[PDB]
Amino acid sequence: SGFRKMAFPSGKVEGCMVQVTCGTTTLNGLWLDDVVYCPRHVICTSEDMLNPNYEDLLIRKSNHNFLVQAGNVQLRVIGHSMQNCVLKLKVDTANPKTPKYKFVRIQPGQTFSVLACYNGSPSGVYQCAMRPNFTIKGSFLNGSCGSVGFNIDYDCVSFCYMHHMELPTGVHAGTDLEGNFYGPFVDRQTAQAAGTDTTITVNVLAWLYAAVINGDRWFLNRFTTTLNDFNLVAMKYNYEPLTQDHVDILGPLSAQTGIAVLDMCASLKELLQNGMNGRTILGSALLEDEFTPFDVVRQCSGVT
Amino acid sequence: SGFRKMAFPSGKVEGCMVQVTCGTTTLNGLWLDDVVYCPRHVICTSEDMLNPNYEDLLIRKSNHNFLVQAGNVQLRVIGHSMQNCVLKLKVDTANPKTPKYKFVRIQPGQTFSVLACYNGSPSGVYQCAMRPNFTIKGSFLNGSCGSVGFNIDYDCVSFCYMHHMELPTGVHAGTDLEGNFYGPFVDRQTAQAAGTDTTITVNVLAWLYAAVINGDRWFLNRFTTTLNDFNLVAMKYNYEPLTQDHVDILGPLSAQTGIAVLDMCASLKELLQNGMNGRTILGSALLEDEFTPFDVVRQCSGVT
Ligand SMILES: CNCC[C@H](C(=O)Nc1cccnc1)c1ccccc1
Ligand SMILES: CNCC[C@H](C(=O)Nc1cccnc1)c1ccccc1
């Protein structure tokens, strides 16, 4: 019993963190096999960030200009290439600590753990959701770029995010491991609009099932609703519209608790319309949307 | 910018997790040097838990009855001993992955990370506070016993907690690494009173400073208070009384933001008396008490 915002164990990712320095700029890199991946803005000075011509800036750089240090050992750079907004530094030594891994592009609403790093050293780990508007509400300071987001399935780390930027609004933006930004963002020191965000409805429902499993039941009611009726409420409260695909993914939680998905939607509808009335659910005074239905099943069953 | 409930990177602790089996009971053990530490209730059957005579139960056990497996390798047990509520299994091989470590007894109100494990395998990591009543509101299922709580200072892991029990109320209880319970709890399947809990005032203040640092300022006001006046409010709202020692630990955050500790106490007093009025602070709709002043400084500065 009990339900926590749990991150994956970060060990396999800690073994991959390196420091990348180019000129006077330092950030984090991810060393997998004989390649070190890092944000391409490592080649910029703070001044260059206003409108960097990355192709031109990278042309002035040679392999020996990228200083890569894994803790205390120095890696020999034998090649460099820019793919989208990431740099790939080929090194002469494969990382002995390379876990089984994949590079994945996650969907908005999905969750992952972040291993926040500075100077190639891990500082902490936390669980994030990729917002529907492709931003993340993380915890990053200057120097944290190159820190990555990931999920783990037994012995396989799926890397889904690399940190690049903090928008003027304090929210975070980054790329997949092929250097493609999530959202409309560009790696430039310019004010950039993040789209209108919404609350991840399927995740709030999943978390309401986790609450019922763990003892918090006060919000259950004698009502039901339809996808159409619920979606009118979701529209008014800026929630993502619920689809049958969302209802389908909630299947296992609905089967375990015996609470029909639309009956849980009616509890959520009443919570949206009336608030929590000064009460809490799983230690929170708001409706939590950073737990997917898979996260709830994993934590509630003890998946390792 | 941004502020998250951050756990320490769990890598150094993952390297210490083993599975301990005695008879039909399996739980987690912590392998440091040539000793494996685990809850002594590994020697009980579910039936024995009603009122176990641990000395008698352990006398029926021999070294070869404790099966210790680190992933896929089997450890040879050459000695066993019970210290308080923990068992110490001497093995013939020192853990090569043993980090620099210490065993510490933490104080209530202090925080730590938990590496939740099942069958010796890590499932996730989360940040906890030890409640003033010595319980923890964690996330643990049967089989998670032996999972540990810890803090890290550069390369030194200070182990402070080992999980033993879930009270009938769903809160968690455990011991320090010498097997002494935090609180009045005994390792027996009996209903046990947890003392009256309080909200950790110094931590809420520390978190209010983190909010100001990261942009959330709406709760700041034109008022001030005294320790005496604030403590009358803390009494009414079941908060721990604030002392000069608490004010002293908030010194660095008060110096950085330029907000006097008693001025922040007046903001907290108004929040206690008026609620949040449907607003949030650092993504929370309640006053958070699981961040110590040290945690706030560490995260706000990027300590690795
Ligand atoms: C040339 N180095 C500049 C790095 C700097 C950067 O890492 N900033 C930042 C700040 C806080 C959290 N996360 C990221 C940057 C990156 C992208 C666009 C503008 C500025
Ligand atoms: C003989 N094995 C019983 C283990 C069992 C136990 O681990 N239970 C438990 C359940 C959920 C979370 N955390 C812990 C136990 C321990 C202490 C007192 C009563 C029962």
XYZ file of C-alpha atoms and ligand atoms in Angstrom:
648
model
C 0.000 0.000 0.000
C 0.874 3.621 -0.546
C 1.382 5.313 -3.903
C 4.369 7.456 -4.786
C 5.644 9.444 -7.785
C 8.265 6.794 -8.420
C 11.201 7.114 -10.779
C 13.004 4.165 -12.375
C 16.261 3.109 -10.647
C 18.854 5.342 -12.328
C 21.914 3.072 -12.089
C 22.066 1.945 -15.719
C 21.823 5.597 -16.853
C 24.389 6.904 -14.300
C 26.933 4.551 -15.918
C 26.456 6.410 -19.240
C 26.866 10.002 -18.033
C 29.909 11.957 -19.197
C 30.996 15.618 -19.229
C 31.374 17.299 -22.634
C 33.298 20.545 -22.912
C 33.799 22.639 -26.025
C 35.663 25.888 -25.520
C 34.246 27.479 -22.385
C 30.904 25.623 -22.512
C 30.305 22.487 -20.427
C 27.286 20.192 -20.372
C 26.391 16.490 -20.066
C 26.756 13.759 -22.643
C 25.355 10.229 -22.913
C 28.002 7.574 -23.691
C 26.476 4.417 -25.320
C 28.794 1.982 -27.107
C 31.506 4.194 -28.809
C 29.286 7.284 -29.251
C 28.700 10.247 -26.918
C 25.425 12.132 -27.548
C 24.987 15.706 -26.338
C 23.047 18.890 -27.242
C 24.659 20.671 -30.172
C 24.565 24.016 -28.289
C 27.730 22.758 -26.448
C 29.586 24.457 -29.408
C 28.100 27.900 -28.675
C 29.201 30.635 -26.334
C 26.329 32.337 -24.341
C 26.603 35.141 -26.998
C 26.136 32.722 -29.977
C 22.762 31.556 -28.598
C 20.852 34.604 -29.885
C 20.776 33.159 -33.447
C 23.376 30.390 -33.877
C 24.360 29.099 -37.320
C 25.230 25.660 -36.015
C 26.661 24.373 -39.322
C 29.145 27.253 -39.400
C 29.986 26.974 -35.700
C 30.610 23.230 -35.932
C 32.892 23.696 -38.999
C 35.319 25.662 -36.775
C 35.503 22.623 -34.417
C 37.732 19.589 -34.693
C 37.614 16.230 -32.816
C 40.303 17.442 -30.351
C 38.134 20.482 -29.354
C 35.469 18.216 -27.747
C 36.740 17.273 -24.299
C 34.878 14.207 -23.009
C 35.511 13.038 -19.476
C 33.750 10.044 -17.839
C 34.322 10.775 -14.169
C 38.116 10.978 -14.162
C 38.967 9.229 -17.482
C 39.381 11.045 -20.717
C 37.807 9.756 -23.920
C 39.564 10.092 -27.274
C 37.256 11.662 -29.881
C 37.765 10.191 -33.357
C 34.749 11.693 -35.155
C 31.952 14.215 -34.766
C 28.626 14.766 -36.489
C 25.529 16.776 -36.027
C 22.182 15.029 -36.383
C 19.312 17.517 -35.974
C 19.977 19.279 -32.556
C 22.361 16.636 -31.162
C 26.038 16.041 -31.671
C 27.385 12.505 -31.913
C 31.005 12.229 -30.841
C 32.543 8.958 -31.910
C 35.071 7.818 -29.291
C 37.780 5.107 -29.539
C 36.401 3.166 -26.520
C 32.992 1.579 -26.127
C 31.410 2.309 -22.712
C 31.863 -0.899 -20.666
C 28.813 0.124 -18.627
C 26.545 0.368 -21.725
C 23.227 -1.222 -20.824
C 20.808 -2.798 -23.360
C 19.104 0.268 -24.759
C 16.814 1.737 -27.373
C 16.075 5.254 -28.567
C 12.353 6.009 -28.496
C 10.170 8.955 -29.371
C 7.569 9.149 -26.628
C 4.057 10.463 -27.061
C 2.710 13.465 -25.126
C 0.987 12.238 -21.935
C 3.563 9.473 -21.474
C 5.850 9.530 -18.446
C 9.576 8.978 -17.916
C 12.318 9.490 -15.310
C 14.943 12.210 -15.579
C 18.453 11.811 -14.251
C 19.445 15.446 -13.643
C 23.199 15.909 -14.062
C 25.821 18.726 -13.831
C 29.423 18.410 -15.142
C 28.715 14.776 -16.052
C 27.745 13.912 -12.456
C 24.249 12.811 -11.411
C 22.518 15.035 -8.867
C 19.049 13.424 -8.665
C 16.221 11.502 -10.302
C 12.564 12.385 -10.697
C 9.506 11.219 -12.619
C 8.077 13.617 -15.334
C 5.229 13.479 -17.829
C 5.716 14.845 -21.355
C 2.954 17.541 -21.422
C 0.362 17.416 -24.249
C 2.074 20.662 -25.468
C 5.470 18.761 -25.598
C 7.111 20.671 -22.723
C 8.234 19.118 -19.425
C 7.888 20.729 -15.992
C 11.264 19.599 -14.726
C 14.012 20.817 -12.424
C 16.974 22.052 -14.454
C 19.595 24.748 -14.004
C 22.261 25.974 -16.516
C 24.704 23.073 -17.009
C 21.950 20.398 -16.831
C 21.682 20.149 -20.664
C 22.422 16.706 -21.920
C 20.594 15.153 -18.898
C 18.273 12.461 -20.252
C 14.785 11.050 -19.786
C 14.210 7.321 -19.899
C 12.051 4.312 -19.121
C 13.277 0.790 -18.202
C 11.727 -2.560 -19.174
C 13.657 -5.192 -17.094
C 17.226 -4.773 -18.496
C 16.471 -2.397 -21.422
C 16.679 1.366 -21.063
C 14.577 3.239 -23.604
C 16.010 6.759 -23.829
C 13.293 9.193 -24.826
C 14.475 12.686 -23.919
C 17.612 14.866 -23.797
C 17.380 18.256 -22.103
C 18.188 21.354 -24.147
C 16.310 24.416 -23.017
C 14.363 26.392 -20.475
C 11.698 28.642 -21.998
C 11.285 32.194 -20.591
C 8.236 30.762 -18.714
C 10.381 28.318 -16.695
C 9.135 25.166 -18.466
C 11.578 22.796 -20.183
C 12.196 21.683 -23.758
C 14.353 19.032 -25.325
C 14.760 16.448 -28.008
C 14.519 12.722 -28.690
C 17.971 10.961 -28.954
C 18.065 11.649 -32.717
C 18.058 15.410 -31.843
C 14.479 16.195 -32.945
C 12.710 18.626 -30.584
C 9.498 17.606 -28.915
C 7.179 20.472 -29.859
C 7.787 23.552 -31.990
C 10.962 24.602 -30.164
C 14.295 25.635 -31.640
C 17.606 25.710 -29.793
C 17.904 29.503 -29.826
C 17.757 32.184 -27.060
C 14.435 33.578 -28.315
C 10.949 33.776 -26.660
C 9.029 30.750 -27.970
C 5.354 29.992 -27.664
C 4.480 26.681 -26.026
C 1.030 25.582 -27.217
C -2.043 25.571 -24.974
C -1.549 22.717 -22.512
C -4.259 20.326 -21.271
C -4.547 17.939 -18.293
C -3.916 14.286 -19.275
C -7.367 12.753 -18.632
C -6.406 9.077 -19.004
C -3.642 9.573 -16.392
C -5.950 11.317 -13.925
C -8.367 8.345 -14.304
C -5.468 5.890 -13.813
C -4.472 7.781 -10.630
C -8.123 7.714 -9.409
C -7.973 3.876 -9.791
C -4.647 3.870 -7.812
C -6.425 5.875 -5.082
C -9.277 3.317 -4.875
C -6.749 0.429 -4.762
C -4.788 2.112 -1.949
C -7.769 3.145 0.199
C -8.845 6.623 -0.942
C -12.505 6.139 -1.952
C -14.403 9.249 -0.758
C -14.713 10.556 -4.357
C -16.628 7.482 -5.626
C -20.281 8.275 -6.276
C -23.636 6.813 -7.399
C -23.345 8.361 -10.863
C -22.267 7.372 -14.319
C -21.638 9.362 -17.518
C -20.999 8.842 -21.280
C -17.864 9.696 -23.357
C -19.894 12.562 -24.934
C -21.163 13.998 -21.632
C -17.764 13.633 -19.931
C -16.032 15.321 -22.893
C -18.274 18.399 -22.497
C -16.863 18.677 -18.910
C -13.313 17.898 -20.141
C -13.696 20.740 -22.691
C -14.789 23.275 -19.996
C -11.941 22.256 -17.680
C -9.172 21.977 -20.317
C -8.803 18.177 -20.068
C -7.840 16.032 -23.064
C -10.946 14.451 -24.680
C -11.402 10.839 -23.637
C -11.496 8.263 -26.421
C -12.321 4.537 -26.547
C -8.523 3.935 -26.892
C -8.103 5.608 -23.448
C -11.008 3.516 -22.032
C -9.296 0.388 -23.477
C -5.956 1.158 -21.770
C -7.833 1.587 -18.448
C -9.269 -1.951 -18.921
C -6.972 -3.756 -16.466
C -7.598 -1.184 -13.683
C -11.327 -1.297 -14.352
C -11.195 -5.146 -14.183
C -9.141 -5.251 -10.988
C -11.297 -2.758 -9.031
C -14.628 -3.606 -10.660
C -15.312 0.098 -11.286
C -16.478 0.693 -14.876
C -14.405 3.331 -16.706
C -17.477 5.555 -17.262
C -18.384 5.325 -13.546
C -14.829 6.566 -12.764
C -15.360 9.347 -15.387
C -18.460 10.398 -13.389
C -16.344 10.670 -10.204
C -13.803 12.755 -12.149
C -16.645 14.921 -13.565
C -17.958 15.640 -10.020
C -14.393 16.420 -8.824
C -13.946 18.846 -11.769
C -17.320 20.540 -11.090
C -17.049 20.669 -7.261
C -13.343 20.603 -6.426
C -11.941 18.443 -3.610
C -13.806 20.372 -0.822
C -10.572 20.641 1.168
C -9.872 16.897 1.057
C -6.938 14.974 -0.448
C -6.423 11.965 -2.757
C -3.163 10.000 -2.359
C -1.617 12.967 -0.481
C -2.482 15.460 -3.229
C -4.971 18.364 -3.119
C -5.196 18.463 -6.951
C -5.979 15.915 -9.690
C -2.658 14.303 -10.606
C -1.871 13.510 -14.224
C 1.743 12.242 -14.136
C 0.881 8.557 -13.715
C -0.060 6.554 -16.779
C -2.287 3.447 -16.537
C 0.892 1.346 -17.115
C 2.644 3.189 -14.257
C -0.267 2.441 -11.917
C -0.312 -1.274 -12.800
C 3.498 -1.515 -12.470
C 3.619 0.126 -9.050
C 0.488 -1.612 -7.710
C 1.896 -5.052 -8.675
C 5.597 -4.536 -7.781
C 7.145 -4.907 -11.272
C 10.991 -4.887 -11.172
C 14.258 26.687 -12.611
C 11.565 24.265 -11.584
C 11.429 22.328 -8.325
C 10.845 18.601 -8.077
C 10.576 15.950 -5.344
C 13.986 14.625 -6.303
C 15.501 11.371 -5.119
C 19.241 10.667 -4.987
C 20.633 8.658 -7.943
C 20.121 5.054 -6.812
C 23.035 3.387 -8.629
C 25.348 2.888 -5.650
C 22.465 1.297 -3.690
C 21.269 -0.913 -6.605
C 24.737 -2.523 -6.575
C 24.118 -3.660 -2.964
C 20.682 -5.257 -3.371
C 20.380 -9.018 -2.932
C 17.541 -11.525 -2.437
C 17.389 -13.354 0.909
C 15.276 -16.475 1.236
C 14.699 -18.520 4.370
C 12.289 -21.409 4.009
C 9.326 -20.113 2.031
C 9.896 -16.430 2.890
C 11.714 -14.098 0.482
C 12.711 -10.470 0.962
C 15.553 -8.052 0.142
C 18.972 -7.814 1.720
C 21.699 -5.158 1.639
C 25.171 -6.537 0.800
C 28.007 -4.243 2.084
C 31.532 -5.659 2.327
C 31.085 -9.364 3.431
C 27.801 -8.827 5.327
C 24.192 -9.024 4.102
C 21.681 -7.096 6.260
C 17.980 -7.942 6.144
C 14.868 -7.795 8.382
C 14.867 -10.639 10.886
C 11.243 -11.533 9.985
C 12.743 -13.350 6.912
C 12.905 -16.379 9.340
C 9.140 -16.361 9.994
C 6.285 -17.939 8.116
C 3.146 -15.680 7.710
C 1.712 -17.720 10.674
C 4.725 -16.978 12.980
C 4.150 -13.210 12.644
C 1.301 -13.121 15.188
C 3.794 -13.268 18.112
C 7.228 -14.478 16.948
C 9.893 -15.591 19.427
C 12.736 -14.599 17.142
C 15.497 -16.075 19.341
C 13.819 -19.486 19.206
C 13.041 -19.249 15.490
C 16.609 -18.269 14.614
C 18.030 -21.175 16.704
C 16.326 -23.618 14.288
C 18.222 -21.949 11.381
C 21.712 -22.685 10.146
C 23.958 -20.729 7.708
C 22.917 -23.026 4.807
C 19.187 -22.179 5.368
C 19.730 -18.514 4.322
C 19.765 -18.432 0.529
C 21.385 -15.206 -0.697
C 21.377 -14.450 -4.396
C 22.845 -11.262 -5.955
C 21.105 -11.223 -9.317
C 22.174 -14.632 -10.608
C 25.154 -15.407 -8.300
C 24.835 -17.286 -5.090
C 26.571 -16.104 -1.930
C 28.034 -18.562 0.573
C 26.813 -17.806 4.112
C 29.490 -18.435 6.747
C 27.811 -16.843 9.785
C 24.543 -15.367 10.999
C 23.568 -13.083 13.857
C 20.624 -11.112 14.991
C 21.177 -7.523 16.085
C 17.907 -5.964 17.297
C 15.381 -6.500 14.372
C 17.994 -7.149 11.658
C 19.906 -10.239 10.690
C 23.533 -9.982 9.619
C 24.592 -12.789 7.310
C 28.342 -13.003 6.983
C 29.254 -14.131 3.455
C 32.609 -15.417 2.101
C 32.796 -12.690 -0.602
C 32.925 -8.942 -0.130
C 30.565 -7.073 -2.503
C 32.807 -5.641 -5.261
C 30.189 -2.928 -5.803
C 30.316 -1.761 -2.139
C 30.299 2.027 -2.159
C 31.773 4.225 0.626
C 29.016 4.100 3.203
C 27.892 4.882 6.719
C 24.985 3.767 8.876
C 23.072 6.726 10.294
C 20.078 7.193 12.537
C 18.087 10.026 11.006
C 15.930 12.447 12.937
C 12.176 12.808 12.349
C 11.562 15.575 9.775
C 14.672 14.592 7.812
C 14.314 13.265 4.275
C 15.839 10.355 2.358
C 15.379 8.339 -0.851
C 13.954 4.828 -0.900
C 14.995 2.227 -3.429
C 11.923 -0.036 -3.488
C 12.902 -3.618 -4.318
C 11.216 -7.053 -4.797
C 13.141 -10.380 -4.946
C 16.411 -8.435 -4.713
C 15.586 -6.388 -7.835
C 15.032 -2.617 -7.810
C 11.618 -1.451 -8.995
C 11.816 2.317 -8.333
C 13.143 5.228 -6.300
C 11.303 7.969 -4.452
C 11.991 10.696 -1.905
C 10.372 10.307 1.616
C 10.431 12.284 4.847
C 10.633 10.464 8.191
C 7.383 11.731 9.846
C 7.631 13.400 13.292
C 5.779 10.247 14.549
C 8.610 8.043 13.034
C 6.468 6.464 10.291
C 7.040 6.899 6.545
C 4.308 7.317 3.925
C 5.967 5.128 1.329
C 4.997 2.739 -1.442
C 5.604 -0.849 -0.355
C 3.947 -4.181 -1.060
C 4.634 -7.616 0.567
C 8.155 -8.645 -0.515
C 9.529 -5.061 -0.329
C 11.005 -5.609 3.185
C 14.707 -5.093 3.268
C 14.404 -2.136 0.808
C 16.474 0.722 2.229
C 16.397 4.482 2.705
C 19.515 6.535 2.146
C 21.167 9.878 1.501
C 24.335 10.504 -0.578
C 27.101 13.052 0.073
C 29.313 12.954 -3.101
C 30.615 9.324 -2.986
C 29.312 8.306 0.484
C 25.957 6.617 0.955
C 24.514 7.080 4.433
C 21.980 4.285 4.949
C 19.303 5.408 7.371
C 16.312 3.106 6.941
C 15.393 -0.536 6.233
C 11.750 -1.372 5.563
C 10.020 -3.862 7.851
C 6.320 -3.248 8.194
C 3.054 -1.788 7.030
C 0.739 -0.755 9.868
C -3.004 -1.567 9.558
C -3.413 2.144 8.595
C -1.274 1.764 5.444
C 1.700 3.777 6.759
C 5.186 2.240 6.910
C 7.620 1.341 9.679
C 11.204 0.207 9.729
C 14.545 0.321 11.422
C 17.971 1.948 11.263
C 20.744 -0.395 9.882
C 21.494 -1.638 13.422
C 17.889 -3.018 13.503
C 16.408 -0.469 15.941
C 12.866 0.601 14.984
C 12.115 4.233 14.361
C 9.170 4.837 16.695
C 7.420 2.509 19.128
C 6.905 -0.294 16.599
C 7.617 -3.992 17.007
C 7.994 -6.498 14.186
C 4.779 -8.369 14.990
C 1.410 -8.732 13.152
C -0.467 -6.700 15.780
C -2.370 -3.346 15.548
C 0.109 -0.689 16.711
C -0.545 2.923 17.549
C 1.493 5.467 15.603
C 1.738 8.678 17.641
C -0.053 11.895 16.683
C 1.746 13.238 13.615
C 2.512 16.910 12.887
C 3.463 18.860 9.734
C 7.218 19.623 9.557
C 7.197 23.443 9.832
C 10.866 24.068 8.981
C 10.425 22.041 5.755
C 7.270 23.898 4.731
C 9.211 27.183 5.236
C 12.145 25.793 3.204
C 9.698 24.859 0.404
C 8.125 28.369 0.563
C 11.672 29.770 -0.031
C 12.079 27.316 -2.997
C 8.777 28.659 -4.385
C 10.006 32.287 -4.163
C 13.330 31.318 -5.822
C 11.514 29.539 -8.672
C 8.871 32.213 -9.336
C 5.870 31.422 -7.117
C 5.442 34.601 -5.028
C 1.672 35.228 -4.724
C 1.688 34.113 -1.048
C 4.196 36.796 0.065
C 2.525 39.512 2.121
C 3.095 42.810 3.980
C 3.052 41.100 7.378
C 5.488 39.772 9.906
C 5.074 37.640 13.048
C 7.062 36.429 16.116
C 8.076 32.840 17.097
C 5.449 33.044 19.904
C 2.613 34.313 17.687
C 3.456 31.882 14.865
C 3.587 28.966 17.334
C 0.012 29.722 18.476
C -1.026 29.199 14.790
C 1.259 26.132 14.480
C -0.463 24.676 17.586
C -3.991 25.187 16.112
C -2.972 23.659 12.774
C -0.889 20.739 14.129
C 2.475 22.078 12.895
C 5.724 21.447 14.778
C 6.653 24.462 16.969
C 9.303 26.629 15.347
C 12.507 27.156 17.309
C 15.545 29.423 16.850
C 17.446 26.269 15.690
C 14.907 25.991 12.805
C 15.287 29.749 12.057
C 19.100 29.235 12.043
C 18.926 26.378 9.499
C 16.765 28.610 7.244
C 19.558 31.254 7.358
C 21.035 30.572 3.906
C 17.597 30.678 2.196
C 16.702 33.839 4.087
C 20.059 35.388 2.997
C 19.706 34.372 -0.648
C 16.123 35.661 -1.089
C 16.341 38.562 1.362
C 13.089 37.452 3.028
C 13.444 37.391 6.832
C 12.459 34.037 8.375
C 9.692 35.661 10.474
C 8.290 37.413 7.368
C 8.100 33.954 5.696
C 6.408 32.638 8.906
C 3.763 35.373 8.426
C 3.104 34.141 4.857
C 2.797 30.584 6.211
C 0.460 31.831 8.995
C -1.848 33.499 6.407
C -1.776 30.322 4.250
C -2.721 28.224 7.326
C -5.556 30.623 8.287
C -6.925 31.217 4.748
C -5.939 28.190 2.674
C -4.573 28.526 -0.874
C -7.857 29.991 -2.301
C -7.725 27.504 -5.180
C -4.174 28.445 -6.192
C -0.993 26.338 -6.302
C 2.624 26.623 -5.084
C 5.280 24.688 -7.046
C 2.530 22.516 -8.605
C 1.025 21.584 -5.232
C -2.378 22.564 -3.785
C -1.193 21.833 -0.206
C 1.744 22.961 1.964
C 4.572 20.520 1.255
C 6.797 19.328 4.077
C 9.069 16.716 2.435
C 11.867 19.125 1.503
C 14.388 20.086 4.149
C 16.291 23.407 3.993
C 19.384 21.375 2.914
C 17.342 19.723 0.133
C 16.217 23.132 -1.141
C 19.767 24.535 -1.185
C 21.119 21.374 -2.877
C 18.519 21.367 -5.642
C 18.540 25.155 -6.161
C 22.357 25.151 -6.576
C 22.811 21.896 -8.568
C 24.873 19.888 -6.031
C 26.088 16.533 -7.468
C 25.808 27.827 -24.970
N 25.259 27.269 -23.734
C 23.934 27.823 -23.455
C 23.100 26.833 -22.667
C 21.726 27.365 -22.232
C 21.101 26.405 -21.220
O 21.529 25.268 -21.055
N 20.158 26.952 -20.430
C 19.217 26.299 -19.601
C 18.897 26.974 -18.429
C 18.167 26.331 -17.450
C 17.757 25.032 -17.680
N 18.034 24.358 -18.803
C 18.759 24.986 -19.735
C 20.788 27.568 -23.416
C 20.279 26.483 -24.119
C 19.348 26.666 -25.132
C 18.919 27.938 -25.458
C 19.441 29.028 -24.788
C 20.369 28.844 -23.773
C 7.148 -13.464 7.419
N 7.022 -12.461 6.362
C 6.002 -11.470 6.702
C 6.317 -10.138 6.051
C 5.245 -9.058 6.263
C 5.526 -7.871 5.341
O 6.605 -7.727 4.779
N 4.458 -7.093 5.083
C 4.429 -5.800 4.509
C 3.321 -5.534 3.715
C 3.300 -4.395 2.935
C 4.383 -3.540 2.987
N 5.459 -3.758 3.752
C 5.476 -4.875 4.488
C 5.174 -8.596 7.713
C 6.205 -7.854 8.278
C 6.093 -7.350 9.567
C 4.952 -7.587 10.307
C 3.933 -8.350 9.769
C 4.043 -8.851 8.480
